[PDB]
């Protein structure tokens, strides 16, 4: 049995043909081999076909997180050459046809709402955009409201700022020929090319009419200030008014009947006016009171202003038949029978003339 | 002083005289030397005596205001207002020859 | 000792009861087993409880990077069905209540500055927004400045573009009833509903007054052009002016004293005017020079224009008592003692009438 | 050969000096050891120096994906304290100097286009920004178009909303002194500080002139409505017009010749006017028809309105020389030779006065 | 030609005649056939002789301008200006009966 | 009734009288008691007889319209229009002494 001890010893040893199946404590064998940490790190290893993590991942160099598929991609990286790098940034990139883009969306239960898309030619915000800072465009057609039939936009071309309009059905389009309002950027002057309608008072230092030149009858159509509403026949309408301390003066008219100057004292309460000087519908000029010229020459030359008898003279006491000279009347007698006579005289325009006898 | 002889009526010579004759029948008087009576009235002195005498130089009219005269067919002379001239009346008892004479 | 060779041979073999502890070169054993690459890949394996990476990670299929916690999540993926996919995008998504949102922030030392939040109803930019392209809204209330007491916004409703104002303390609110300015999108016409105040010149082709109709005394209140500043008593103020080559004409007045038409020649230097035609405070019409009518009939019917003596006639040489007929004076004698007479005549308005004797 | 059986048995056992090289089936040995799953998980383990994944990665707790380099970083995480968390968000963060920023870009073949940068002080959109919702700024200088020489911006300071302009070459700058247009936020009133130029009609309820006060000759320069274009000499220009049913009245003039009131009946077709009342260049007031005062006193006091012979009286039959009293003419005889006389009388202004005899 | 007989004064008949009599004491003259003297003056020819004769047909006044006449109480006839008519003077040495007669 | 005695001419006393004399040579008449003839005319009754008599009270002029009178150097009295007063004519056959007398 001395070889039985050698046989039992051999029987206590790992058999080639059993390939480790005869190891009595396999976890200890792995341990003794030095493989426990290998076992533990492989048990805790993120798997390439997907996994869940309980700690964070950190890239320590210039490495990229990518989705790469069908020769296209989405990529996140961090550009940073040194701590002092003046153009360092986290970047997000899509490729490789130019039309792969960026989308932000949120989910409430099973509903998905897209919030923002960023594409090659435009950031599309599908919700509101609320900016605490200033909103600045560096394009000429900088600010647009494309809503409904016509778009509205502000165009600053560097020299003038326009309020612009599109044609109908083209609210994203270029401007048409309308120029409702623009500003001269160098001088501040405001212009409007399609007229202006003001409710209430329009106050200005001066009003300049783009005034016209032409024939008499074209005064109907000259550029002017005018009353848009006709004056009704036999109704009163003033178009211009000057206030004085105790009275007001008006340019206006009685429809189809009168046009001119009217005065109303502030103390008046009964209907009417206190002074009138106006043209009627036949072209006469009428005044409710006196017409006082500074020079009366064209009137004084029309009328007799005085009549008188001139100096008395005596004829020669003479014949049985006598006729007084032209313009004279008999004013006495002296009996050689003489007769007194005087000339009748008329004052025209400051000169005394002798009357004529037919 | 002022002296206009043989003042007679003649047609108006100018446009303004023509209008006054056309509209107011003014009979324009002229002296034999061509002076217009109505325009020369303002050249008389205010406080002198103005004499009217006939072709025979009998004084027929006297005044201090020449515009009150109608000297058609007579002569007008202006003389200073003196006591020797205030005695002449409009009767035919005074003549004129470089002054007033008695009878 | 022949079995000692068998005993030593058995003693040179791996003992079951030692469980690999008697392996002389354990790293070689691992190598011979074929486990070295297992050792090396587990040593270099990203660990599920967090790790640092020196190379990038790439998803080769449609896989997601997610943060999933408390039934909510944040997710990044890449949508791409083929290279020709016309709606391909990198997407960022939050869930699942609708209020999980997106935040961008930056750190300078220990200070954190939030820069942008994107939520279900609005992109909130907490800094400035500087857009190199055009800024376009597709909402009617497209452009708003919500600063301080009152908000201002531009509303284009498709037909008209309004400049709008909120009530006080409601700068994010709807518009109130004010209409300071709007534009007709179809015609370009500008309207203003709250009046207009211009410093300097307002030039227009025409000015249209929304003119009134009524009683005489209401001319005080008719819609008009007027002087906002009263004319001071005894001071001059013009409200309307027409320039001619060598003179200017004005409608204006002397306060409480005069109102009408004044002419000033451009050559004048002393104070005053060159022509005046105006109403005074009693309603008279005054002219500094002549008043020249084209028709004098209403004057010519008031006055004697000429006087004369008519044709001389002779009475019948008769009685010791005689009276000249009506209107006649004695103009001569003929001695049967006859007397010459003439009628006194007056010219009224172009007709010669015979004078009456009382 | 009894020990040969013991020798062969020992020879069938794993030799220490061979270190597993004598294992006949090494993959089975690994299997029997219990190491197959270790082998499989290490073969499928993501490697720390970079790898490709065929499934997604999910963070199950509050863990971060980071790029950390040169003491700076880029980081993605998910903030969420519970499902009911009211401020939960996916966040993107850069650090640590404040100037590391966020960039979005896209690639078409080898071309890279930057689309958007988000920095400490501004979101920079390098393309268009198209917002389906409303665009709102909460800064006073809320909306700007910085294009070319001059910038344009709208400034709402809470009390007034201004249309503002920069100086030249400073289109991102503050406003200068120009005030082209502003709105009173409380009242809606529009003001313009640099004048206004309207093509076409300017309609308003009233026009208020900022009217002046001064000397007569300053009426040339008083604030007024006026014709910007001079009236050409001998040409007609109206500045004010009132329409009646059948006629129109104008204030206007003939250049250098006439200024006043003109009437044109609507039925007129030949050139000219139907009524005229106007001042000429000498200051006279002319009317094409009659001038009709309501009171003639200043005319009636200038002229003789009638002449007549008064009541007949008889002298005392007396001397050979007789002169009729002042103002009287001889009108008859009675032969004690008496003479009839009458006084010549003139009517001035309604009173009969006796004529004087020089 | 023109011939107005027994021209006499009567009250104004129309409103315009009433105003002229009210304001200027116009005494309106009418011929026995009802013609108004002052309005018929313009119907006389300019260069004819106008005769004024009394009820006994004695010519008392002659003129070439009818407006210089006051025919109250007399008659007016217009005759052609011929040499046989220029000899008649305003004295009572000429009568009228379808022409001018001597004595 | 109205009675103005010894009406005589005197210089104008007021500014308005001074203008009328300056411009129209009005000779202002005043009665011996200081009444202005031309302003007192409107105080006469319309349908009464107005008498003009000389210093010897001989009636020289009669009218029903006082404005047709020139009473310079005479007196004017207004009397009721009765049959006993309508017989007086402007001849010197009637005098006045608180009424009209024959011869």
């Amino acid at each position: 049995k001395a070889v039985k001890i050698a046989m039992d010893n051999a029987n206590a040893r790992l058999a080639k043909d059993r390939n480790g199946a005869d190891i009595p404590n396999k976890p200890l064998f792995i341990q003794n081999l030095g493989l426990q940490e290998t076992v533990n790190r492989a048990r805790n290893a993120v798997q390439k076909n997907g996994d869940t993590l309980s700690g964070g991942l950190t890239f320590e160099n210039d490495s990229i997180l990518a989705w790469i598929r069908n020769t296209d991609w989405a990529k996140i990286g961090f550009k940073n050459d040194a701590d002092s790098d003046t153009d360092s940034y986290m970047w997000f990139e899509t490729g490789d046809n130019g039309n792969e883009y960026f989308k932000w969306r949120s989910k409430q239960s099973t509903t998905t709402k897209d919030l923002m898309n960023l594409k090659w030619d435009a950031l599309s915000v599908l919700v509101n955009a609320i900016v605490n800072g200033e909103v600045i465009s560096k394009s000429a057609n900088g600010l647009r409201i494309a809503y409904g039939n016509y778009g509205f936009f502000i165009r600053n071309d560097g020299s003038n700022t326009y309020f612009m309009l599109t044609n109908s059905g083209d609210n994203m389009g270029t401007y048409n020929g309308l120029r409702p309002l623009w500003i001269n950027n160098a001088t501040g002057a405001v212009s409007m090319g399609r007229g202006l309608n003001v409710s209430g008072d329009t106050l200005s230092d001066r009003f300049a009419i783009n005034s016209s030149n032409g024939m008499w009858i074209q005064m109907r159509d000259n550029n002017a200030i005018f009353g848009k509403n006709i004056v009704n026949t036999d109704s009163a309408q003033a178009l211009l008014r000057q206030n004085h301390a105790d009275r007001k003066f008006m340019i206006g008219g009685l429809g189809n009947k009168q046009f001119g100057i009217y005065m109303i004292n502030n103390s008046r309460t009964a209907n009417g006016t206190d002074g009138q000087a106006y043209m009627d519908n036949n072209g006469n000029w009428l005044c409710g009171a006196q017409v006082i010229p500074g020079n009366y020459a064209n009137f004084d030359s029309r009328y007799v202003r005085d009549v008188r008898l001139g100096t008395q003279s005596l004829t020669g006491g003479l014949s049985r038949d006598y006729k007084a000279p032209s313009g004279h009347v008999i004013t006495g007698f002296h009996t050689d029978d003489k007769v007194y006579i005087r000339p009748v005289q008329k004052n025209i325009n400051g000169t005394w003339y002798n009357v004529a006898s037919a | 002083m002022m002296h206009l002889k043989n003042i007679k009526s003649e047609n108006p010579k100018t446009k303004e005289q023509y209008q006054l004759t056309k509209n107011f029948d003014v009979i324009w008087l002229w002296s034999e030397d061509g002076k217009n009576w109505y325009e020369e009235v303002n050249n008389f002195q205010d406080d002198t005596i103005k004499i009217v005498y006939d072709e025979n130089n009998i004084i027929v009219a006297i005044t201090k205001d020449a515009s009150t005269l109608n000297p058609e067919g007579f002569s007008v002379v202006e003389i200073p207002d003196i006591t020797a001239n205030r005695r002449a009346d409009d009767s035919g008892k005074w003549m004129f020859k470089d002054g007033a004479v008695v009878k």
Side-chain angles (χ1 to χ4, degrees), chain A, chain B:
Chain A
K1 280 207 183 316
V3 81
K4 171 174 166 293
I5 266 66
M7 190 72 171
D8 285 359
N9 186 13
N11 275 7
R13 261 102 173 113
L14 287 177
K16 301 189 197 190
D17 58 326
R18 295 262 291 158
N19 301 284
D22 51 353
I23 292 171
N25 194 5
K26 304 173 190 299
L28 179 57
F29 197 98
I30 291 156
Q31 283 189 350
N32 287 141
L33 244 193
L35 287 182
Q36 184 58 54
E37 192 192 11
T38 295
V39 167
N40 294 340
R41 293 187 60 82
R43 184 179 14 247
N44 195 44
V46 181
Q47 295 295 285
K48 286 162 52 138
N49 64 315
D51 227 326
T52 302
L53 279 92
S54 54
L57 295 170
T58 296
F59 299 109
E60 67 186 304
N61 44 20
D62 199 357
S63 296
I64 292 153
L65 175 69
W67 293 251
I68 300 181
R69 201 189 324 154
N70 307 128
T71 76
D72 297 309
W73 60 74
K75 286 173 184 180
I76 314 184
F78 179 41
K79 192 274 188 178
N80 187 274
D81 297 329
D83 178 59
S84 62
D85 193 337
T86 46
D87 190 34
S88 173
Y89 49 88
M90 179 186 192
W91 50 272
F92 307 88
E93 165 188 308
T94 55
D96 197 36
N97 296 115
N99 51 20
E100 303 86 15
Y101 64 93
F102 305 93
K103 175 187 300 300
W104 294 257
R105 63 196 185 198
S106 291
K107 278 196 98 141
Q108 184 262 302
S109 170
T110 68
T111 296
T112 300
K113 178 182 188 165
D114 286 7
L115 306 173
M116 190 181 287
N117 294 310
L118 170 70
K119 304 181 178 185
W120 188 268
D121 290 300
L123 174 75
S124 164
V125 182
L126 310 163
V127 288
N128 306 117
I130 301 157
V131 181
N132 291 353
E134 301 160 11
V135 173
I136 309 174
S137 171
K138 299 193 168 185
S139 291
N141 295 345
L143 302 159
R144 176 181 302 245
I145 306 188
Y147 182 87
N149 206 24
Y150 300 96
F152 162 83
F153 57 104
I154 302 176
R155 169 181 176 90
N156 166 16
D157 66 23
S159 294
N160 297 278
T161 300
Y162 299 85
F163 293 3
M164 293 302 211
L165 295 166
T166 76
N167 293 318
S168 180
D170 191 22
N171 68 21
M172 288 293 271
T174 197
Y175 50 80
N176 58 19
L178 299 183
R179 307 291 184 262
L181 191 150
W182 70 98
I183 301 170
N184 184 315
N185 292 357
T187 62
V190 176
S191 304
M192 300 177 188
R194 293 293 282 176
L196 174 62
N197 311 284
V198 183
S199 302
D201 290 359
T202 299
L203 165 75
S204 190
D205 292 316
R206 309 192 302 165
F207 298 99
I209 300 159
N210 187 21
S211 48
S212 319
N213 272 278
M215 313 190 314
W216 274 127
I217 197 174
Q218 291 179 301
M219 285 188 321
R220 304 161 147 164
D221 309 315
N222 288 348
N223 288 340
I225 185 161
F226 67 101
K228 176 191 144 199
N229 308 122
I230 214 163
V231 53
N232 303 139
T233 298
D234 291 332
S235 157
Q237 166 188 114
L239 295 191
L240 176 146
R241 174 168 49 84
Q242 186 176 64
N243 294 347
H244 303 217
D246 293 298
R247 49 192 44 90
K248 304 172 162 60
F249 291 89
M250 278 79 40
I251 306 279
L254 186 70
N256 251 4
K257 299 305 179 53
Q258 310 186 2
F259 176 87
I261 295 175
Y262 299 92
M263 179 188 73
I264 302 169
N265 292 328
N266 291 347
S267 58
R268 162 173 294 275
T269 47
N271 183 227
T273 60
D274 296 289
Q276 317 83 31
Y278 62 87
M279 179 180 294
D280 70 3
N281 52 290
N282 307 293
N284 311 121
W285 184 252
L286 296 103
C287 183
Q290 293 187 307
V291 174
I292 314 179
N295 186 324
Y296 286 91
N298 55 305
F299 292 95
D300 288 355
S301 71
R302 302 180 73 82
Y303 312 118
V304 176
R305 75 171 297 279
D306 204 2
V307 283
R308 80 180 177 192
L309 307 169
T311 283
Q312 194 172 230
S313 85
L314 262 81
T315 79
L318 210 65
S319 48
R320 298 208 150 198
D321 168 279
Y322 173 63
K323 312 182 194 192
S326 173
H328 289 71
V329 298
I330 279 143
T331 48
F333 313 99
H334 178 88
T335 71
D336 191 68
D337 277 18
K338 307 244 194 218
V339 61
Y340 291 59
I341 58 166
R342 291 185 190 266
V344 178
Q345 297 189 320
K346 60 191 172 185
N347 187 318
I348 317 295
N349 199 22
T351 300
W352 281 108
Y353 297 101
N354 291 288
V355 153
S357 285
Chain B
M1 284 168 294
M2 280 291 298
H3 195 127
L4 312 149
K5 294 213 211 174
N6 306 356
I7 293 167
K8 305 201 177 189
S9 73
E10 293 193 293
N11 282 330
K13 300 177 195 296
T14 81
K15 71 180 223 326
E16 189 158 17
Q17 292 142 227
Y18 179 81
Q19 286 302 123
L20 282 158
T21 291
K22 171 160 165 285
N23 294 337
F24 304 93
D25 294 339
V26 166
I27 296 177
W28 294 97
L29 301 174
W30 319 78
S31 59
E32 64 181 11
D33 62 296
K35 287 171 187 181
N36 160 42
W37 160 257
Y38 283 118
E39 275 164 338
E40 294 277 8
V41 161
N42 284 109
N43 301 333
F44 282 85
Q45 293 181 29
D46 286 351
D47 286 311
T48 52
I49 297 173
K50 294 89 179 161
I51 298 274
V52 169
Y53 58 96
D54 59 8
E55 212 92 78
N56 265 5
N57 282 40
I58 286 63
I59 298 151
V60 302
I62 303 150
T63 197
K64 260 191 168 185
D65 178 4
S67 69
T68 75
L69 298 172
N70 189 348
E72 191 171 6
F74 299 90
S75 315
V76 177
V77 57
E78 171 174 52
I79 61 169
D81 175 36
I82 72 187
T83 306
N85 289 331
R86 286 183 62 196
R87 34 180 210 161
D89 45 20
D90 56 331
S91 177
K93 274 152 62 140
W94 309 79
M95 330 186 187
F96 172 82
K97 175 52 204 301
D98 283 50
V101 302
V102 183
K103 286 186 175 183

